[PDB]
């Protein structure tokens, strides 16, 4: 069956430029991200987390995102909500990409403790405070209490790089991290 590889990483750290360069190469990947924002799609899955967070008043991403990012009693519930949702559609993914030895999944920011040892293996992204920093302030969504509140959520990059099989730096020219990618893929292929 296929293997699982996780991919890991604080905010900013090249999650989502790993992901979009594997499938550019024609790799199986699941953009975790993207799937919650399909099941945020789906009327029931709305229904039920209006029923679970009335405070929210409203179906809407960025009021979700202004609460859970203000209260974590929300965010959890959110969290184990969402979570087994997101599984069943890791399963799926895994089921309808039986054929390929292997293929990638993003591990989606603040989920990192619930996929704990889901996967076959794990690769997690570093890279400098600095340039995290820099990255965030260059995207559209900079918002300076958001990135401080991932900062004090997420797990610690030396936590994830002690749960990782492997670490790539994407604290280097992007030329280079793409060589690190091809280094990864040709690890994993000698693993099978």
């Given at each position: 069956h296929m293997l699982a590889i996780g991919i890991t990483g604080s905010y900013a750290s090249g999650k989502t430029f790993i992901l979009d360069y594997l499938a550019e190469k024609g790799y199986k990947t699941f953009c975790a991200d993207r799937c919650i924002k399909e099941l945020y799609q789906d009327l029931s899955v709305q229904t039920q987390i209006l029923k679970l967070?009335?405070?929210?008043?409203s179906f809407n991403i960025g009021k979700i995102s202004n609460l859970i990012y203000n209260n974590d009693l929300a965010r959890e519930k959110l969290q184990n909500f969402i979570y087994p949702l997101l599984i069943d559609k890791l399963i799926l993914f895994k089921k309808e990409n039986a054929n390929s030895k292997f293929g990638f999944a993003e591990i989606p920011l603040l989920y990192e403790a619930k996929f704990?040892?889901?996967?076959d293996f794990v690769v997690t992204i570093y890279c400098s405070e600095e340039i995290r920093m820099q990255r965030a302030i260059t995207r559209?969504?900079?918002d300076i209490e958001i990135y401080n509140k991932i900062k004090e959520i997420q797990l610690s990059q030396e936590s994830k790089i002690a749960k990782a099989d492997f670490a790539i730096n994407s604290g280097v020219d992007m030329l280079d991290l793409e060589k690190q990618i091809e280094k990864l893929i040709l690890v994993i292929a000698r693993k099978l």
């Open positions: 967070l009335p405070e929210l008043e704990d040892k889901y996967f559209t969504s900079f």
